[PDB]
């Protein structure tokens, strides 16, 4: 409703860097709000794409941002009669970024890894890796839970069980309010997908540079499966956390697997031990149900509600014809120990190939009416196909079925405006929560400030 589409703010990165692929708000130890931006194709030292991170201070006029520096050099360690190797070319540093307390986590899902032992090898595979920074102090740490030192022949002799070689850890990421980093790894266990959790404090205190293989004892990984419903399901394509079991001491995990069960797609809600509490199945094969997930209480009962995006959903139209437009599903959490029912609301896109539901961002209470609101991206939507973000207001019964406001992309064709979203943070301290929108195709980020309601 009351986001201002007249006076925007633009931050820009280097051409070709894909500045805006991921973003998040970041607060320093003094509460000052900045913007962390991932640019997964920023050039590195060898004039080669490795990715990069930028930490943008809040200025109404926007502009350029300083780099958040991470070690971009390939590493080698000869130890235990083996050779350990990291490969950072085209790793995609900045394909996901998240901020918690005064700490920034920025991941490279396609960092490769290999181990050599005489004439055998582990195989050079994308285990992924995440980088952690405390900007005010300069502290640095890393976390790569899928690096192993097992040789290729052992996996073959053991029928490829517990094969973490293609995790792509950091493909998605989230932090609990207690400080536990949770990583999505959609390629884990031979492309079933896995989750990796560890406390940020323990990640820092157990890391030292040059070790490459080290133990984070408090960590916790999910499990392999023999159930074919999970094969190639990409469990961990997206992640989120919320309160869904009525017990406030436990934190629950929300995991997207958009190709679960022969591309039907699914979303699962789990406890912190990866035990399955609920499962929400997709409506239509190949619609990518589970591409995005979001958790926020939209109907003011104080119980977290769930939203699922299926950007490739095909809507039925006249004369038995389908049109790909995208769809968003709303599930309201019921009172007490009960399972999530059918969706309370279905939101369906309008523009062909618009990919409505590619990103869903909670906004907090944008219009200050006592109900939290959401924003949905259609990165190729709008009548021009340039991209659109749509705002939906909460209400006692859920969400309004029609958008209160529509943000048309200010960028040229192909910017992917809305591919990443973030709200619920007041960046200018005017008392209204604001919204940042990434458009990596144009290497830019747009800031929409919320202003007082007109109506």
């Amino acid at each position, epitope marked *: 409703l009351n986001l201002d589409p007249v006076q925007l703010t633009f931050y820009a990165g280097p051409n070709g860097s894909q500045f805006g692929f991921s973003l998040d708000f970041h607060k320093d130890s003094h509460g000052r709000v900045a913007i962390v931006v991932g640019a997964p194709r920023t050039l590195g030292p060898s004039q080669e794409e490795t990715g990069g991170v930028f930490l943008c201070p809040w200025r109404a006029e926007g502009g350029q941002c300083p780099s958040l520096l991470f070690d971009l050099r390939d590493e080698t*360690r*000869n*130890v*235990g*009669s083996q050779t350990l190797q990291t490969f950072k070319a085209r790793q995609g540093l900045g394909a996901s970024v998240v901020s918690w307390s005064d700490v920034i986590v920025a991941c490279a899902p396609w960092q490769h890894w290999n181990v050599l032992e005489k004439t055998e090898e582990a195989e050079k595979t994308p285990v992924g890796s995440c980088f952690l920074a405390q900007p005010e102090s300069g502290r640095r740490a890393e976390y790569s839970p899928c690096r192993g*030192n097992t040789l290729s022949r*052992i996996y073959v002799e*053991n029928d490829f069980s517990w094969d973490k070689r293609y995790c792509e850890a950091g493909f998605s990421s989230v932090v609990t309010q207690a400080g536990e980093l949770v990583l999505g790894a959609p390629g884990g266990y031979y492309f079933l997908g896995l989750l990796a959790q560890a406390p940020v404090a323990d990640i820092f205190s*157990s*890391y*030292r540079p*040059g*070790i490459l*293989l*080290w*133990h984070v*004892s408090s960590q916790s990984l999910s499990f392999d499966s023999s159930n074919p419903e999970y094969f190639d399901g990409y469990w961990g394509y997206s992640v989120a956390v919320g309160e869904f079991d009525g017990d406030l001491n436990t934190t629950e995990y929300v995991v997207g697997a958009p190709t679960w069960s022969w591309t039907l797609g699914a979303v699962e809600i789990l406890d912190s031990y990866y035990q399955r509490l609920h499962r929400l199945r997709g409506e239509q094969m190949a619609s990518y149900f589970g591409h995005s997930v979001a958790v926020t209480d939209v109907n003011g009962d104080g119980r977290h509600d769930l939203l699922v995006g299926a950007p490739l959903y095909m809507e039925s139209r006249a004369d038995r014809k389908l049109a790909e437009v995208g769809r968003v599903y709303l599930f309201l959490q019921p009172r007490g120990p009960h399972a999530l029912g059918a969706p309370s609301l279905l939101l369906t896109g309008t523009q062909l190939y618009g990919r409505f539901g590619s990103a869903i961002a909670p906004l907090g209470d944008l219009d200050r009416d006592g109900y939290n609101d959401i924003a949905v991206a259609a990165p190729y939507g709008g009548p021009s196909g340039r991209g659109q973000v749509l705002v939906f207001l909460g209400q006692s019964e859920g969400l309004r079925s029609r958008p209160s406001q529509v943000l048309d992309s200010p960028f040229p064709t192909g910017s992917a405006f809305g591919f990443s979203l973030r709200g619920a943070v007041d960046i200018d301290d005017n008392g209204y929560p604001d919204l940042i929108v990434g458009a990596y195709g144009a290497n830019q980020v747009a800031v929409y400030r919320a202003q007082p309601v007109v109506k």
Partner: antibody, heavy 119, light 108 residues
Framework: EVQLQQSGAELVKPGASVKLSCTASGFNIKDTYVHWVKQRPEQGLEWIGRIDPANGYTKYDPKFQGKATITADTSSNTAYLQLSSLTSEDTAVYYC????????????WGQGTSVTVSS | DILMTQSPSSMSVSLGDTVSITCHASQGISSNIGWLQQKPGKSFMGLIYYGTNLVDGVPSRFSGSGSGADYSLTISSLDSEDFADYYCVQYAQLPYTFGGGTKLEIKR
């Protein structure tokens, strides 16, 4: 807190066999490698070998091949060192070791188990 | 197998002194070395791993340095508990191999 409690002092005869144990406390024995080290006053410290209790794969110094066998039971959180065809040279104190953070280090040690071979 | 020549086998020193123990390898080990302490009649405690990194709980008066095949352990301002046996161990290659040890004894 990580603690490695080993079995009591052993006292056996030449030619017999003995099986020492190393029970993990405060953690899961499955977490890291578990090594076995032999100490004598004259010969010093000798690395026997290691085991990955997760999968059971073992490595050995070729000096101990056939004499020492390293096993582990994740169910009982314990690792074992079995010595056969015992002789007077096998009389020593034996330690189990695991690393702290580095996968290959030797940081945490058990209190040791004394073995004496005598007719 | 990699030989670890540790020196000296013993030193007679005093409280508050700054002493150093070296360890020489028959080939390069690229900081894959740990340092160990054994108090009299007791078991082992880890001090250093990967050349320079203190084990959790170890005071900072202990430090390790070196590169290639030559490494050192320094104890600034000796303490009454610091009189014990010290050993190096390399893990650059299997089998792991140890040094001969070093006993710090009280001078009088």
């Amino acid at each position: 807190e990580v603690q490695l409690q080993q079995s009591g002092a052993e006292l056996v005869k030449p030619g017999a066999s003995v099986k020492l144990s190393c029970t993990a406390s405060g953690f899961n024995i499955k977490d890291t490698y578990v090594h076995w080290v032999k100490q004598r006053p004259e010969q010093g410290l000798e690395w026997i070998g290691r085991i990955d209790p997760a999968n059971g794969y073992t490595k050995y110094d070729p000096k101990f091949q056939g004499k020492a066998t390293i096993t582990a039971d994740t169910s009982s959180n314990t690792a074992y060192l079995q010595l056969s065809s015992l002789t007077s040279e096998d009389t020593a104190v034996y330690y189990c070791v695991r690393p702290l953070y580095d996968y290959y280090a030797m940081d945490y040690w058990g209190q040791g188990t004394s073995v004496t071979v005598s007719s | 197998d990699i030989l670890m020549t540790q020196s000296p086998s013993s030193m007679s020193v005093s409280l508050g002194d700054t002493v150093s123990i070296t360890c020489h390898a028959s080939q390069g080990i690229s900081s894959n070395i740990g340092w160990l302490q054994q108090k009299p009649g007791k078991s082992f405690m880890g001090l250093i791993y990967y050349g320079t990194n203190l084990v959790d709980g170890v005071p900072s008066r202990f430090s390790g340095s070196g590169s290639g095949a030559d490494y050192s352990l320094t104890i600034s301002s000796l303490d009454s508990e610091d009189f014990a046996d010290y050993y190096c161990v390399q893990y650059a290659q299997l089998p792991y191999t140890f040094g001969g040890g070093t006993k710090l004894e009280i001078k009088r």
